[PDB]
């Protein structure tokens, strides 16, 4: 059961504030990321399920494209759905996973390293990307799909130029063919943590729609 | 880690349409139940965590009291929450569990046997009560507490007769002291399942508040 692709803005210039805001200089200084930038769930360690294949400096913000390739992830989500969730649809295991992910983990969160005094930011700044329900930064929705082309397609304001650099760099990433095997039991726990930690969140589908409208997805 | 009690209306007469409505006649006919009704998580099979100790036909609808006593539930739920989840609060283990359950599974859903054509509703009609996020029926919020009389107290329109009858029958249930073991793994799976199956639900907390008003529990306010 082959890989999944995920993409989206990691931040949108001029939209946040305080601790959250990302600057053009800093973003410019921080690309290309120096090392593999893993992708995990809700910032948990020991919970890597993929990696950023490329990040690009689009006009509106830094934009990324990721691979998530963890066979158990599909097992665990498919096991959880009840028998009538899909009504009379017949879905491939790939399609089901795409839908469940999309709706279970619809946002991303970039974490960065703390800089020491006077220390100019460089390519070591970005640490990883977490999938999560709501990211704190404006417009941090993700799209998941079966190809990198389909994953980026719904981002209407992503420049053509950035999209081209993005896909090209991603096709050359060393991580692109990789697999993350993970214990079913540890995944089930991570994902239950997601639900329990967001169980009290109010108006979640309204905030997701808002994040989509921010990112420029229909 | 002890038992906890759960209670609420399984339906309110005249408050649902079509498929969902339970009439007085159906309830009258279906009580008391032929055998003990298990409590499970969101209708999943192989995940019983308790049992319905008694059901009564209150004026407004059928009302139940149940026990939940699955020892691993507290550990699984507590393992799930982030470490600053409770901020500064000092809570017993039992208080943490009741809070987490109350908010994770705030409703109940009475599941019925599907009848064959020509088959009249009887004492075997009721199959189980599932704990869940929002039940399809109006007014099916539940209350969890450390004792049965406390579990039932917030339902300010439950008749005193029904309330006394409820507690009496529960006091003589054979399930009163049972325990329901599950492996951690099987329980984590079942709880994740509720999350997945309910992830698409819109306005759940507004619908919770509405279910509270419907059932006659003093509605939770947030004015302070
Ligand atoms: Cl890159
Ligand atoms: Cl964030
Ligand atoms: Cl362009
Ligand atoms: Cl919502
Ligand atoms: Cl009974
Ligand atoms: Cl229901
Ligand atoms: Cl809500
Ligand atoms: Mg498609």
Numbering used by the authors:
A (entry chain A): 1 to 218
B (entry chain B): 1 to 224
Sentences from the paper on this structure:
Herpesviruses encode a unique serine protease, which is essential for herpesvirus capsid maturation and is therefore an interesting target for drug development. In solution, this protease exists in an equilibrium of an inactive monomeric and an active dimeric form. Here, we report crystal structure analyses of the active dimer, the diisopropyl phosphate-inhibited dimer as well as the non-inhibited monomer of pUL26N from PrV (224 amino-acid residues). The tertiary structure of pUL26N is a β-barrel consisting of a four-stranded antiparallel and a three-stranded mixed β-sheet surrounded by eight α-helices.
In the native structure, a chloride ion occupies the oxyanion hole, which is formed by the β6-β7 loop (residues 133–142, further referred to as oxyanion-hole loop, OHL). The backbone N-H of Arg136 provides the first hydrogen-bond donor of the oxyanion hole. A water molecule as second hydrogen-bond donor supports anion stabilization, as does the positive local environment established by these two arginine residues. An extensive network of hydrogen bonds stabilizes the OHL. Moreover, the N-termini of helices α8 of PrV pUL26N point towards each other with the positive dipole moment compensated by one chloride ion per monomer. The quaternary structure is a homodimer related by a two-fold non-crystallographic axis with an interface area of 1,273 Å2 (native dimer) and 1,258 Å2 (inhibited dimer) comparable to all previously published structures (~1,300 Å2, determined by PDBePISA). The native and inhibited dimeric structures of pUL26N are nearly identical with an r.m.s. deviation of 0.39 Å (437 aligned Cα atoms, secondary-structure matching) over the whole dimer. A putative cation was found in both dimeric structures from PrV. Since the crystallization buffers contain MgCl2, it is highly probable that these cations are Mg2+ ions. Thus, Mg2+ ions or divalent cations with related properties are presumably necessary for the observed crystal packing of dimeric pUL26N from PrV.
